[PDB]
Design a protein around this ligand. Structure first.
Ligand SMILES: *Cc1cc2c(nc3c(=O)[nH]c(=O)nc-3n2C[C@H](O)[C@H](O)[C@H](O)COP(=O)(O)OP(=O)(O)OC[C@H]2O[C@@H](n3cnc4c(N)ncnc43)[C@H](O)[C@@H]2O)c(*)c1C
Ligand code: NA
Ligand code: NA
Ligand SMILES: [Xe]
Ligand SMILES: [Xe]
Length: 490
């Protein structure tokens, strides 16, 4: 009725979709990345708005405030729980979908760029490349991830040891707050600008665009991928890795992927084969690396190479909006501060990763720049002392095959509890996991006590400052979801 009435006064009607609209199913599904959340049993938005101008976003928020219809914002749609376009329980909401606002304006000489939230990471990276072969930006690894959610929740990838997370390399933003007002760094103040850069999506307003500093990379980088089965000595090698990798020079990141009794060591090095080989021989000879393992290429070519194994298809891999990969998926994460006993590595490789519904485990080492930033300097607290992060990933491809992978995910998380961080058990906000806890709503406001349960896991000692900031910029909890920062007020 009147919410829609208000929208049509301010926004071109071709940018508005109701459930009855012919294109609604298509617009809704276009950036859903998880087949668990696309099916008809999921709660759907009442309306979808696809702005092309910032004034459309402002109008949508004003209308929502006036008619008390809450808005969930979607940029790339990768939210692991789908909270950008679905709710867990029946309720009325509109989705503001930013996929049409996708400009990237790079200033090569100043080494800065303005990037719309609706741009995907691959589009950002590709625009940086068109400006310079020796500039980069340290955000996620997956090209179809949206800038908006990736930066809001922190954002890290293969440059994290060198340059930290995306959010700490953001120098300004353009944001629409809960009253429809347009803000930048100057107008929003220290607290709000601190919170929005890593404090998770949705909670602190709709970010329209981000200004980033662009960072130097050499014209040639080197990648290798070396696998070790357990008979090839994987357990002893990974047991050494967990101590060595966090301490390596910042130019060298060695992550691990495991999906059975075999570990694949994937390395990105900001330099040439010529200097890498002696570094490896000196610091990590157990891996058995030699020049035949090296793949030299530009930074921009390393993005599809690391993620997909592709060397030959830059535009197709980075500029892709077909949305073809739509697994059913479950995810969990952990942080590790103390080395695992060799027996735990034996169990993970020989036992947990050879079970029905077993998934994939990805291990990213910290240390260096990401660990040098104080824990409270940004909302992202997983810094000093971190050896590595773990992501537990489960994919399946048929609707009725969820039981086994969901059970595995729960069981291995229980198994790992004694060896990972605790009090709280830390997790990465952008690896969203609703089983960590969800909000309770009382008198139409999310409660501080329910928020704290999962909030301390994502944000540790930063959670209370996030909530106090929330209370100042959005006391009525307009921008929320089931796992958004609750307001903490007078
Ligand atoms: C699907 C997927 C996710 C990945 C992948 N690899 C990652 C990597 O290498 N590094 C990472 O740091 N993260 C990786 N992730 C996780 C993604 O970073 C997260 O899933 C991001 O949150 C996704 O962002 P986006 O694609 O924009 O997802 P949405 O579902 O639109 O939003 C997430 C969340 O944030 C809110 N939000 C969106 N847009 C905005 C704006 N503009 N302002 C404020 N808040 C925003 C949403 O409401 C929602 O709550 C690899 C793959 C394949
Ligand atoms: Na702890
Ligand atoms: Na989940
Ligand atoms: Xe806000
Ligand atoms: Xe969050």
């Amino acid at each position: 009725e009147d919410f829609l009435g208000c929208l049509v006064k301010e926004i071109p009607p071709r940018l508005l979709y109701a459930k009855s609209s012919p294109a609604y199913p298509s617009v809704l599904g276009q950036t859903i990345r998880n087949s668990r959340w696309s099916s008809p049993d999921n709660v759907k938005p009442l309306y979808i708005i696809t702005p092309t101008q910032v004034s459309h976003i402002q109008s949508a928020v004003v209308c929502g405030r006036r008619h008390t219809v809450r808005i969930r914002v979607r940029s790339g749609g990768h939210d692991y729980e789908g909270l950008s376009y679905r709710s867990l329980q029946p309720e009325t909401f509109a989705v503001v979908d930013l996929n049409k606002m996708r400009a990237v304006w790079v200033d090569g000489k100043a080494r800065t760029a303005w990037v719309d939230s609706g741009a995907q990471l691959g589009e950002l990276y590709y625009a940086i490349y068109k400006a310079s072969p020796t500039l980069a930006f340290p955000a996620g690894v997956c090209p179809t991830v949206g800038v908006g959610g990736n930066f809001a929740g922190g954002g890290f990838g293969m440059l994290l040891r060198k340059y930290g997370i995306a959010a700490e390399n953001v120098i300004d933003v353009k944001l629409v707050d809960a009253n429809g007002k347009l803000h930048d760094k100057k107008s929003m103040g220290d607290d709000h600008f601190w919170a929005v850069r890593g404090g998770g999506g949705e909670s602190f307003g709709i970010v329209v665009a981000w200004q980033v500093k662009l960072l130097p990379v050499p014209p040639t980088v080197t990648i290798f991928k070396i696998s070790k089965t357990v008979s090839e000595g994987a357990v002893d090698i990974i047991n050494k890795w967990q101590v060595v990798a966090p301490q390596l020079p910042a130019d060298l990141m060695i992550r691990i992927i495991a999906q059975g009794p075999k570990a694949t060591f994937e390395a990105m090095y900001l330099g040439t084969c010529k200097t890498l080989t002696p570094l490896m021989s000196s610091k990590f000879p157990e891996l058995g690396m030699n020049p035949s393992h090296c793949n030299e290429m530009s930074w921009i070519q390393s993005i599809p190479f690391v993620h997909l194994g592709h060397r030959d298809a830059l535009e197709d891999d980075l500029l892709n909006r077909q949305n073809s990969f739509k697994p059913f998926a479950e995810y969990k994460s952990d942080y590790v501060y103390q080395p695992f006993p060799k027996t735990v590595w034996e169990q993970i490789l020989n036992t947990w990763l050879v079970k029905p519904g077993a998934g994939i485990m990805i291990f990213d080492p910290y240390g260096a720049t990401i660990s040098a930033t104080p824990e409270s300097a940004t909302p992202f607290p997983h810094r000093k002392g971190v050896l590595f992060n773990i992501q537990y990933v489960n994919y399946w491809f048929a609707p009725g095959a969820a039981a086994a992978p969901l059970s595995w995910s729960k069981d291995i998380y229980n198994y790992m509890e004694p060896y990972v961080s605790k009090n709280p058990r830390q997790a990465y906000a952008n690896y969203r996991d609703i089983d960590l806890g969800r909000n309770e709503v009382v008198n139409d406001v999310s409660t501080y006590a329910s928020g704290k349960v999962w909030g301390q896991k994502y944000f540790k000692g930063n959670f209370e400052r996030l909530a106090i900031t929330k209370g100042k910029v959005d006391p009525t909890d307009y921008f929320r979801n089931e796992q958004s920062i609750p307001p903490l007020i007078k």
